[PDB]
Design a binder for this molecule. Structure first.
Ligand SMILES: Nc1ncnc2c1ncn2[C@@H]1O[C@H](CSCC[C@H](N)C(=O)O)[C@@H](O)[C@H]1O
Length: 553
DNA sequence: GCATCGATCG
DNA sequence: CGATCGATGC
């Protein structure tokens, strides 16, 4: 179900992190600080951020006027109690919806942790309302609308320090957020906390410190701070252990490895390079990494998007009904005809180059076909057993409103793709993965929703698919990915999405090095008698890829 | 049509 | 620890 905390985003910020954010805000503030400074928290909740910033300000002998807004009355009451029990008298709380979906004069400082509510929980209607009101595109999240609103409620030269999900840094839905941030603020600092797990909830948070633009026109170079968990440590890399708690690591000004308790964290500090190009994800990398990235891009002949279609698997929107392995254990009246049961490949049966399989027994009840040259859903009158099987789940299948709004049948697979494209030789790879697992497939099976597949644009997969495979499975491409597309989940899992794989560079497919790579990949995928010679061939491929683009790192 | 996005989700 | 899977946007 969807808990009230899930729909309202009621997660409170830990004490030490709040203090760190408040201290950075008061360090970046360069505006008078002798009069009463107004501070705003548009989603104050418990009032933790206001308490932290007031503690720091009273440490600096700075008088604040704290203002909190929250549409829940229990949060208002507890925040009022906590603020009264402190030694502060000048505060004010407002029980209202901040997005306004009285009056308030503009503010000098904004410290905020807005709620992160995805588009599915908001519903399409409120999502389109928020998009129309705050000029947002794509799958809007609530914190983006909150950013727009709280920025509109801020003075010129005022400092914002706001912690949100980091996903706006790399997704295409965060394009609008990146555009807004770079349009309205002189970016002071962007801290990607990565997988440090400060909150009990599963989220990778990022903090944004900025100064709102004026009109006299200003300068400063935007810097970033990235910290991630490091599982694989290089032998020649030294680790620093001069810090006890993780909260002490957010005040380090030297990049490198730091050991805290049971974990080792890689910390990088550098500059944001040209954030005005908000189209592509904002690359947070050091100088050497960025120069290597730019050199690889300059020496590249093209990209995968120019050579091959990168499609997603089937999205049935009812996996428990359409994809099963126990088709023979069902009653004989409901066992569908084998004409409809097509073998499928999931993300679990995924190795590099090629998997041996076991028949998987995983088969999908494919509901579409090529009738009169077009893609049409099947007729259940021809398949009575499949009709009965689907009548068994009619309740769950007909509860999909988006299917009925499209004037489509209730028993259909939502995204069936083209039934004739499955027979083409293709590359397959899983989405969620710590390592690239791209492999070749000839037998003409269907691809699962947790996987993507690749088919050539020109009708000659004779060599291009093999070259793309040899490129994608290399450590070179892994470094390129970790530099360019920084979308990671917990435990080092990268996201191999279409918007990321389309930007994989490709060397000249008629180079001698490229042809040797193609031959080596053919040997790897065809013959399966190799064991640890696979590592030798892979290292040879690495050296050939290096010679294809440029030499080493 | 078809790829996204996840205060992930047990 | 580890790999979602179904509403959603365009
Ligand atoms: N539309 C809205 N307008 C105002 N407050 C809202 C809101 N939607 C959610 N909230 C409030 O936002 C809070 C998110 S929890 C954040 C608490 C606090 N900012 C902290 O970091 O400690 C909740 O208390 C919720 O009641």
């Amino acid at each position: 179900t969807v808990s009230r905390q899930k729909a309202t985003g009621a997660h409170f910020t830990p004490d030490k992190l709040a203090e760190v954010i408040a201290k950075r805000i008061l360090d970046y503030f360069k505006g008078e600080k002798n009069r009463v400074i107004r501070v705003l928290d548009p989603a104050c909740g418990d009032g933790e951020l206001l308490l932290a910033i007031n503690k720091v300000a009273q440490s600096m002998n700075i008088q604040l006027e704290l203002i909190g807004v929250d549409f829940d009355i229990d949060a208002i009451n507890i925040a009022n109690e906590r603020l009264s029990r402190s030694g502060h008298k000048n505060f004010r709380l407002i029980n209202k919806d901040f997005l306004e979906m009285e009056e308030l004069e503009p503010v000098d400082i904004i410290i905020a942790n807005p709620p992160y509510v995805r588009t599915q929980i908001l519903g399409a209607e409120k999502a389109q309302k928020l998009r129309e009101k705050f000029n947002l595109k794509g799958r809007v999240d609530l914190y983006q609308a909150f950013l727009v609103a709280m920025t509109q409620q801020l003075k010129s030269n005022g400092i914002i320090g706001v912690i949100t999900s980091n996903r706006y840094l790399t997704t295409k839905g965060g394009e609008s957020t990146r555009k807004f941030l770079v349009s309205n603020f002189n970016i002071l600092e962007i801290m990607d906390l990565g997988d440090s797990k400060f909150f009990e909830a599963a989220v990778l948070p990022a903090i944004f410190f900025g100064e709102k633009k004026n009109k006299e026109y200003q300068s400063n170079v935007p810097k970033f701070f990235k910290i991630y968990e490091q599982s694989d440590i290089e032998a020649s890399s030294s680790v620093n252990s001069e810090f006890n708690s993780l909260i002490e690591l957010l005040e380090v000004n030297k990049s490198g490895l730091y050991s805290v308790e049971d974990k080792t964290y890689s910390i990088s500090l550098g500059k944001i390079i040209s954030p005005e190009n908000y189209k592509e994800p904002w690359i947070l990398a050091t100088e050497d990494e960025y120069e290597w990235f730019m050199k690889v891009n300059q020496n590249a002949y093209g990209f995968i998007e120019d050579f091959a279609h990168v499609k997603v698997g089937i999205k049935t929107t009812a996996d428990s009904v359409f994809i099963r392995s126990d088709w023979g254990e069902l009653p004989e009246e409901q066992i569908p005809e084998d004409k409809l049961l097509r073998p499928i490949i999931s993300a679990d049966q995924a190795n590099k180059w090629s998997v041996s399989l076991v028949g998987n027994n995983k088969k999908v009840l494919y509901t579409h076909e090529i009738r009169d040259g077009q893609i049409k859903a099947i007729n259940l009158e021809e398949f009575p057993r499949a009709k009965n099987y689907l009548e068994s789940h009619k309740e769950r299948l007909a509860s999909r409103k988006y299917v009925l709004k499209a004037n489509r049948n209730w028993y259909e697979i939502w995204v069936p793709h083209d039934p004739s494209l499955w027979d083409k030789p293709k590359i397959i790879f899983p989405d969620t993965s710590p390592e690239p697992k791209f492999f070749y497939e000839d037998k003409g099976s269907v691809v699962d929703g947790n996987c993507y597949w690749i088919i050539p644009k020109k009708e000659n997969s004779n060599d291009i698919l093999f070259l793309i495979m040899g490129i994608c499975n290399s450590k070179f491409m892994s470094k390129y990915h970790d530099i360019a597309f920084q979308n990671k989940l917990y435990a080092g899992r990268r996201r191999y999405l279409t918007q990321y794989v389309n930007k994989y560079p490709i060397p000249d497919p008629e180079s001698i090095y490229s042809k040797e790579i193609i031959s080596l990949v053919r040997e790897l995928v065809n013959n399966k008698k190799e064991t640890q010679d696979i590592n030798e061939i892979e290292n040879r491929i690495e050296k050939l890829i290096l010679r294809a683009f440029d030499i080493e790192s």
